Amino acid sequence: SSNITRLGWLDDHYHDLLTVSWPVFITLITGLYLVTNALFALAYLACGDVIENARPGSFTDAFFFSVQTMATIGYGKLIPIGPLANTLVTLEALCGMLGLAVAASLIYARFTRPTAGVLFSSRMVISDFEGKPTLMMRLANLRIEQIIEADVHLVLVRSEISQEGMVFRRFHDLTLTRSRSPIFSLSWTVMHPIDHHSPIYGETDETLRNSHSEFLVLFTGHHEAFAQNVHARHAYSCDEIIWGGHFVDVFTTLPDGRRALDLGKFHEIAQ
Amino acid sequence: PRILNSDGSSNITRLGWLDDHYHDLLTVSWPVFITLITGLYLVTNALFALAYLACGDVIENARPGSFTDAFFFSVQTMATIGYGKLIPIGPLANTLVTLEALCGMLGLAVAASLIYARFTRPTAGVLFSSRMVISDFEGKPTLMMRLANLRIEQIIEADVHLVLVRSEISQEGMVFRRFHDLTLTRSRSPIFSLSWTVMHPIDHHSPIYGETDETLRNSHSEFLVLFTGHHEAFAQNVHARHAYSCDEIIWGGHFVDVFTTLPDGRRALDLGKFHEIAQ
Amino acid sequence: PRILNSDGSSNITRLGWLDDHYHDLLTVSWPVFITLITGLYLVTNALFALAYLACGDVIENARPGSFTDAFFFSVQTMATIGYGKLIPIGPLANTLVTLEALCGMLGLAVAASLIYARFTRPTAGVLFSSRMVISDFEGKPTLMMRLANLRIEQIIEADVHLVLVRSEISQEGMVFRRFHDLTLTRSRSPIFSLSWTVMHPIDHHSPIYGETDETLRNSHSEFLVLFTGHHEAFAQNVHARHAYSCDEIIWGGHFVDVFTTLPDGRRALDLGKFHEIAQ
Amino acid sequence: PRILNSDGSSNITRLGWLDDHYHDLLTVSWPVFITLITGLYLVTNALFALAYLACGDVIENARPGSFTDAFFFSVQTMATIGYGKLIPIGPLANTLVTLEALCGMLGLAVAASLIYARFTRPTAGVLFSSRMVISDFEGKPTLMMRLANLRIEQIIEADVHLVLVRSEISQEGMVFRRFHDLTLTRSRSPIFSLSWTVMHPIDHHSPIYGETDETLRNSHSEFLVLFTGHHEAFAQNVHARHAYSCDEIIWGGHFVDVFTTLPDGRRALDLGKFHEIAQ
Ligand SMILES: [K+]
Ligand SMILES: [K+]
Ligand SMILES: [K+]
Ligand SMILES: [K+]
Numbered sequence A: 001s002s003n004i005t006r007l008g009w010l011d012d013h014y015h016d017l018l019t020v021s022w023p024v025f026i027t028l029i030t031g032l033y034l035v036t037n038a039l040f041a042l043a044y045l046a047c048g049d050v051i052e053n054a055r056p057g058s059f060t061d062a063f064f065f066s067v068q069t070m071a072t073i074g075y076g077k078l079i080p081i082g083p084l085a086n087t088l089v090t091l092e093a094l095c096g097m098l099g100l101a102v103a104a105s106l107i108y109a110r111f112t113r114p115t116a117g118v119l120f121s122s123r124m125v126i127s128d129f130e131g132k133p134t135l136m137m138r139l140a141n142l143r144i145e146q147i148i149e150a151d152v153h154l155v156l157v158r159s160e161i162s163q164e165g166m167v168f169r170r171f172h173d174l175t176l177t178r179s180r181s182p183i184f185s186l187s188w189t190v191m192h193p194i195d196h197h198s199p200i201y202g203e204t205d206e207t208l209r210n211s212h213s214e215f216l217v218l219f220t221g222h223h224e225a226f227a228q229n230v231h232a233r234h235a236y237s238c239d240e241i242i243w244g245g246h247f248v249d250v251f252t253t254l255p256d257g258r259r260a261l262d263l264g265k266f267h268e269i270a271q
Numbered sequence B, C, D: 001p002r003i004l005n006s007d008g009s010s011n012i013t014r015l016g017w018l019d020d021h022y023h024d025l026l027t028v029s030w031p032v033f034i035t036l037i038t039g040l041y042l043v044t045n046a047l048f049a050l051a052y053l054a055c056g057d058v059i060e061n062a063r064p065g066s067f068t069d070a071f072f073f074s075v076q077t078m079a080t081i082g083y084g085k086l087i088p089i090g091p092l093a094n095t096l097v098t099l100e101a102l103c104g105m106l107g108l109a110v111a112a113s114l115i116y117a118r119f120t121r122p123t124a125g126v127l128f129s130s131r132m133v134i135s136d137f138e139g140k141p142t143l144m145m146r147l148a149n150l151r152i153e154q155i156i157e158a159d160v161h162l163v164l165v166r167s168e169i170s171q172e173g174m175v176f177r178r179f180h181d182l183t184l185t186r187s188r189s190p191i192f193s194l195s196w197t198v199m200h201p202i203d204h205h206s207p208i209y210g211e212t213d214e215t216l217r218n219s220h221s222e223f224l225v226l227f228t229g230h231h232e233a234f235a236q237n238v239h240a241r242h243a244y245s246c247d248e249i250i251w252g253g254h255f256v257d258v259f260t261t262l263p264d265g266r267r268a269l270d271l272g273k274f275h276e277i278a279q
Helices: A013-019 A022-047 A059-070 A082-111 A205-210 B021-027 B030-055 B067-078 B090-119 B213-218 C021-027 C030-055 C067-078 C090-119 C213-218 D021-027 D030-055 D067-078 D090-119 D213-218
Strands: A005-007 A118-120 A124-129 A132-141 A147-161 A167-173 A180-184 A187-193 A214-223 A228-237 A241-243 A251-253 A259-262 B013-015 B126-128 B132-137 B140-149 B155-167 B177-181 B188-192 B195-201 B222-231 B236-245 B249-251 B259-261 B267-269 C013-015 C126-128 C132-137 C140-149 C155-169 C175-181 C188-192 C195-201 C222-231 C236-245 C249-251 C259-261 C267-270 D126-128 D132-137 D140-149 D155-169 D175-181 D188-192 D195-201 D222-231 D236-245 D249-251 D259-261 D267-270
Touching: A013 A082, A022 A059, A022 A082, A022 B090, A059 A082, A059 B090, A082 B090, A082 C030, A082 C067, A082 C090, A118 A228, A132 A147, A132 A214, A147 A187, A147 B222, A167 C188, A180 B155, A180 B177, A180 B222, A205 A241, A214 C188, B021 B090, B030 B067, B030 B090, B030 D090, B067 B090, B067 D090, B090 D090, B126 B236, B140 B155, B140 B222, B155 B195, B155 D222, B188 D155, B188 D222, B213 B249, C021 C090, C030 C067, C030 C090, C067 C090, C090 D030, C090 D067, C090 D090, C126 C236, C140 C155, C140 C222, C155 C195, C155 D188, C175 D188, C213 C249, C222 D155, C222 D188, D021 D090, D030 D067, D030 D090, D067 D090, D126 D236, D140 D155, D140 D222, D155 D195, D213 D249
Parallel strands: A005 C267, A124 A241, A259 B013, B132 B249, C013 D267, C132 C249, D132 D249
Antiparallel strands: A118 A132, A124 A132, A132 A187, A147 A167, A147 A180, A147 A214, A214 A228, A251 A259, B126 B140, B132 B140, B140 B195, B155 B177, B155 B188, B155 B222, B222 B236, B259 B267, C126 C140, C132 C140, C140 C195, C155 C175, C155 C188, C155 C222, C222 C236, C259 C267, D126 D140, D132 D140, D140 D195, D155 D175, D155 D188, D155 D222, D222 D236, D259 D267
16 A cells, blocks of 8 residues: 555546446446437437337437437337438447447456455564574465466565665565465465575564564466466565464374365464 | 375365355356356346336236236346337336346346356367386486377467475474476477477486485375466467376386378377387 | 657658458557448448348338338348338348348457457556656766656556667678667566656666767667556556657756655655756 | 478378367358357257247247248347247247347357457567578677568567577487577567567587588478567567578578668668578
């Protein structure tokens, strides 16, 4: 979240249509729908009394005729009369379907958006693994389907002072022992070894709070479920780092002797 | 007792309604999907019918206060067949009409997308050698297996990952399952079109360096292959995965050749040899 | 006399009907596209009308041998409004009907795809500083320019390329145009949301090292910027390009700052200062 | 007797019904595809007609027990033209109606997707120099060829692979076909818009180092080019492949230039020169 005030209507039409809330989107469409039919109705009246069984010079009748015509229900009470009437008809028809074509695309465009079934460990931990302190957290796939060429970024964000004494926010991508997982299917524990190259080297808790430093995780991959790309983002604050902690294991052997995953343990950190 | 199946799906027991609507709709079996749609379809028409009755006797040639008539009218209206026997009467009737119409088409728009979303799935025409082999190639033992494209169409910027999965111990004594991506001599094939023999030279950097068969079984180690690429057939990305167990490694073996020279002098492919390993 | 325009499109004269149908349909202006469709629409109905007349007087309530009547019938039939005055008569009439219908819908299917294909294009809300500047930052002269995101939505794993294009002479004396990608202090921004000032430190490795203004004009050298990233707004990838000429480099200049404190004490972005370069 | 054709498709003889439905539907020729759809269309209506007859005389104004009438009614119903002569009668008739309707639209949804799936395929407007040349550039012999963009639209992050394919003998004495990707002086072009001359310097690392013509024929060696990039025209990825045989290498040749200055003083591109190699 980046709240702020941007100083600077139809400009971004396509974005806006995909960005709007479903209620609003439907409204807009509806509005457009009603509107255009009214317009068409007027076109009809404009010709004057060109529709069978229509109360003379009545907009309602014309309007409803226009819908029956444009939605192509074509009930059959109200009917065109004469060249002008019908031309407007064959024009509306086309208009109607084009509208459908445009509506569909929008619908589909906004409708077809997957979500990685990915869950983030509520905490990070800093603990010794393979002889160097390692910052870690872990992802669990929440669905049976697999994610291919999945990969993750662990980014430290913190404030720094320039020689000139500008106090700004700067981003550090943190080298992970494993950044790609071509086949992510159950759980993945991501690790950033801390050594003389880690921007968090020889850093205590006190020092982390002091730079007002947070940790941002971006996960992305190709989800087999949707046959489409997915991603998920999470953020941690200095205080969600459990120093010395170790993620419990979620891997079990059943009585049956069959391996298992207990995602109840997923958020549990031994200490 | 393998952790990973041949199809590449992990082999574990997992221990755990409208929440995942979109996934579920794409995940359901066609029978069910069609049912759901149908249900929704019938349902909404019934609802609309009630709306009509609610106004009371607002449809031409409808038996007074009869749901059937109203229902069927509602379908003729929403599917926009608009036969013409049953007709709206008065403002209330018609407003409901012009509302249904819109509803009908929107439904179509939503149904279509779903249909298309679930319908437009490709499958790499890719076949995996049933076995791997460890044998000397160019002066270093090399683990290899091979892929054959099963279709005439080509796969572009195809690439493959060979991942060893096995049990280990940390200095801290954590006993975990670790993944080792194994350096392949060749990982890209910009035009994968017939057969590709993937190789992982084994040297002091290979996590399987100086490892016998006994040692592989001992770490309960398997090998996972992920292939992916852009299929010209579908003009869309495809992939395929496969897994091998320690015992599907044929030591000393050599893949037979399926590549021939015809009498004509034109090269050829005999995909019967594909799974054949000389020994 | 610039090779590249500001919009990033190369500025050259190219020297070279139904050949490129699909491209052309997506490339045409909406007015024209709609016209084409319309034309096709009217055309085919006329054709069908003739088919009807050809049979001769096969439509209920149609003025004998009148094209208009047949034409309008054909539309009512193909758009499937099917009013009900004009009706088919006999096998020939109806076969043509059930053929048109199918035709109508297929047309829709084709029109839709085109519409959707041309309709579903995002545009990075990205604005480029009208100028570049060369100035000392952190103790080395640095070429820089800056991007501002014009929308509230964020761009993920955004990244940018700064490419110098200029003329050179080979030892063999070929005088060609070469591209140099210029090392940026920061080329990736996983989360681009407001403004980004891109920098190319100039040192013994920069192809523009120890280069004055005179020398830049002399190689007729320009600077091309390509930005790309995944836009949350569209949940789809976006990009933007821009180009600068030697003379849009403000030597010694410094981009002003665009971050403000409101009277309200709320922080702000004045994309008013965005193009302002102190000197 | 080339292994690979110019189109990039391997040139080999392969030695080996409803199984591959989706592929087949996208792979079929338009004529056939349309036929299939038509067939399906007619077929299902016939089926439905029978359903109607099966009930017996349930359609207004239908000649008793006549399939034609029922069939045509079925189309008017399923395409939802719903003219109004033929009308359902009784619950059975109408249920079949509201079922057909749904069926009709679903069909449309399926047809559309297919249409769109097969319809929305781009083609890089890319042209390959008919020949390669080996000549001295910047003090080392360089293998080169060149691409020209055939459209006004630009290709972004375009890139190309130059792959040598030739026969070899392993130390173990396996006589196989090996692919060598050849290091190019420039493999990426973030903005490809007019012409691009690709180069593979030949030095002690080039698999074609110190190789004459005789030696190339001898390994029956060819050169495969894969180009790919994101086409602004289609807002979608495109690619193109090409292949060259040993004998399409013009030794000592130099590509002519296609860049001109008009009388007007405006730069230009003459595609007559594109295939011309000075010697
Ligand atoms: K109708
Ligand atoms: K009617
Ligand atoms: K798409
Ligand atoms: K209709």
